């Protein structure tokens, strides 16, 4: 019963909150990565994949803020990175936690009923 | 009569002054919601989807043109007899055309609506954001033809604004449209309060012999990258305890509270946004 309901909650969270969050997060990440890589003149990080990975490192608490220096207008680079950090890390990821708490609050009976139907199947 | 079209009721509610007591709630009245849904499902869903597709194509072409910008120095850059250079230049022309299109669309909005300088910067955030993206694109063009490399700075701010503006089209889908209304309400209320207090604390504790370097080192703590030995211990521990362990968790808690109380208000605001979209499509 307990693990069953926990798995049902995981399913519900993956289908609603993770989905909505991943769409908005991927849009922001691609936009800010296309901006940063365009600003970069050349070097190791002059590819879309490398810059996307560098900006995704921020989501997992491993962002550098100085991962490259092959650019002009350091102010432009710093402002872009700070905007990306404030929009994703400090806002969107905490909002995901807050929306996950609301979902937990509202899907107890639904999650127990779904588990019971699964066991009936 | 005088509901669908006339001062029609729908055009009165949608284009209200943002001081109206129940601007978001008057659309819940029985006939109006069902009329707006009818207009949506009949013709405004298809028109809006076409607009979204066109905007996605525009952003893809702009991203491709900016990605393959030449690095030679002191524009303008002479076109070579290469197919790739012919694709890049046509993409750039399309990007500038879209920027001009959005600039003129913002001017037309500010003219026909005449915002009162408070609802200008308190409501209609989408119009201002698209207009500012267009402004960045036009400034980029002006700098580009002035032989200035700062054109790239204006262009990359236009690109990040244009990709972040794709969140406008989340309206037209209820779940994503309400999530985007909830993102707006978090940004205006919780992020603002937290950022004011957080910036005060950061500047105080920061005040590596330069202010910028120490501010960056102390901001690294917020993103889970703080060193604690980057170059004193009591100051760093006080800053960590007051920002990382207290204020950032308090932000999460307050965000949870907001989400709990804005559920109904977030749906009403999304419905009003879609009504505005349906009226704009009808008029144009
Ligand atoms: C504060 C933001 C909140 C406003 C907002 O944005 O949400 C509005 C939607 O906006 C959009 O288009 C989505 C764009 C948000 C993308 C993320 C932010 C990116 C910018 Br910020 C930067 Br990071 C990119 C540069 C990044 C590069 C960094 C470099 C820096 C130099 C909603 O407002 P509305 O559409 O007008 O509807 C109103 C409604 O009708 C009315 O009835 C109600 O009353 C009002 O409330 C409205 O709902
Ligand atoms: C041609 C079709 C033009 C068109 O139908 O408009 C579609 C797009 C999007 O326009 P929108 O009003 O829906 O965006 C919201 C803007 N706001 C906030 C001002 C309402 O406009 C455009 O990018 C048109 C310019 C893009 C040209 C490159 C084509 C790819
Ligand atoms: Na970390």
Q: Which two tokens stand for residue A108?
A: 């107890």
Q: Which two tokens stand for residue B1?
A: 């009569």
Q: How far apart are CA B167 and CA A29, in angstroms?
A: 13
Q: How far apart are CA A92 and CA B187, in angstroms?
A: 10
Ligand 1 within 6 A of CB of B248: no
Of all ligands present, the nearest one to the C-alpha of B244 is: 3
Q: Which residues contact B34 (CB under 8 A, 6 or more apart)?
A: none
Q: For residue A76, how far is its CA from the centre of ligand 3 (angstroms)?
A: 25
Specify burial of residue B163 (Cβ count, 10 A radius: 0-12, 13-18, 19+): buried
Q: For residue B56, how far is its CA from the centre of ligand 2 (angstroms)?
A: 9
Please report the atom of ligand 2 found closest to the CA of residue B131.
19
Q: How far apart are CA A71 and CA A80, in angstroms?
A: 13
Q: How far apart are CA B51 and CA A31, in angstroms?
A: 19
Q: Name the DSSP letter for residue B77.
A: P
With CB atoms and an 8 Å threshold, state whether A97 touches B176: no
Which of A20, A26, A27, A31 has the most B C-beta neighbours within 10 Å, making it the best mutation to test the interface with B? A31
Among B55, B105, B279, which is best to mutate for testing ligand 2, by the most ligand atoms less than 8 A from CB? Answer: B55
- HEC secondary structure over chain B: CCCCCCCCHHHHHHCCCCCCCCCCCHHHCHHHHHHHHHHHHHHHHHHHHHHHHHHHHHHHHHHHHHHCCCCCCCCCCCCCCCHHHHHHHHHHHHHHHHHHHHHHHHHHHHHHHCCCCCCCCCCCHHHHHHHHHHHHHHHHHHHHHCCCCCHHHHHHHHHHHHHHHHHHHHCCCHHHHHHHHHHHHHHHHHHHHHHHHHHHHHHHHHCCCCHHHHHHHHHHCCCCCCCCCCCCHHHHHHHHHHHHHHHHHHHHHHHHHHHHHCHHHHHHHHHHHHHHHHHHHHHC
Tell how far CA B101 is from the center of its chain.
18
Ligand 2 within 6 A of CB of B9: no
* Atom 23, ligand 1: residue with shortest CA distance: A83
Backbone angles phi, psi at A71, to 5 degrees: -160, 170
State the smallest CA–CA distance between residue A11 and chain B in angstroms: 18
Backbone CA torsion sign across B141, B143, B144, B146: positive
Q: Which residues contact B202 (CB under 8 A, 6 or more apart)?
A: B215, B218, B219, B239, B243
- Closest among B98, B112, B113, B105 to B131, alpha carbons compared: B105
* Atom 46, ligand 1: residue with shortest CA distance: B123
B187 contact residues in A (CB cutoff 8 A): 91
**Which resolution in angstroms does this entry have?**
2.3
Residue with tokens 């955030």: B125
Q: Which residues contact B245 (CB under 8 A, 6 or more apart)?
A: none
Q: How far apart are CA B11 and CA B277, in angstroms?
A: 11
Bin B147: left if φ > 0, else alpha if -120 < ψ < 50, else beta. Answer: left
With CB atoms and an 8 Å threshold, state whether A58 touches B220: no
Which of B151, B165, B223 has the most A C-beta neighbours within 10 Å, making it the best mutation to test the interface with A? B223
State the smallest CA–CA distance between residue A99 and chain B in angstroms: 7
Backbone angles phi, psi at A40, to 5 degrees: -70, 135
Beta bridge partners of residue A71, listed in sequence order:
A40
Residue with tokens 């005060």: B200
Of all ligands present, the nearest one to the C-alpha of A64 is: 3
Q: Which residues contact B115 (CB under 8 A, 6 or more apart)?
A: B123, B124
In chain A, the N- to C-terminal Cα span, in Å, equals 15
* Atom 19, ligand 2: residue with shortest CA distance: B127
Q: How far apart are CA B118 and CA B51, in angstroms?
A: 29
With CB atoms and an 8 Å threshold, state whether B255 touches A97: yes
State the smallest CA–CA distance between residue B7 and chain A in angstroms: 38
Q: How far apart are CA B77 and CA B71, in angstroms?
A: 9
State the smallest CA–CA distance between residue B253 and chain A in angstroms: 7
Backbone angles phi, psi at B23, to 5 degrees: -60, -40
């Amino acid at each position: 019963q307990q693990m069953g309901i926990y798995a049902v909650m995981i399913e519900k969270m993956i289908l609603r909150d993770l989905c909505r969050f991943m769409f908005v997060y991927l849009v922001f990440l691609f936009g800010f990565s296309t901006a940063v890589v365009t600003l970069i003149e050349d070097g190791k990080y002059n590819s879309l994949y490398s810059t996307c990975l560098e900006l995704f490192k921020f989501t997992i608490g491993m962002g550098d803020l100085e991962f490259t220096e092959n650019y002009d207008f350091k102010a432009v680079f710093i402002i872009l990175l700070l905007a990306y950090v404030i929009l994703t890390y400090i806002l969107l990821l905490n909002m995901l936690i807050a929306l996950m708490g609301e979902t937990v609050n509202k899907i107890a009976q639904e999650s127990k009923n779904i588990w019971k139907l699964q066991r009936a199947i």
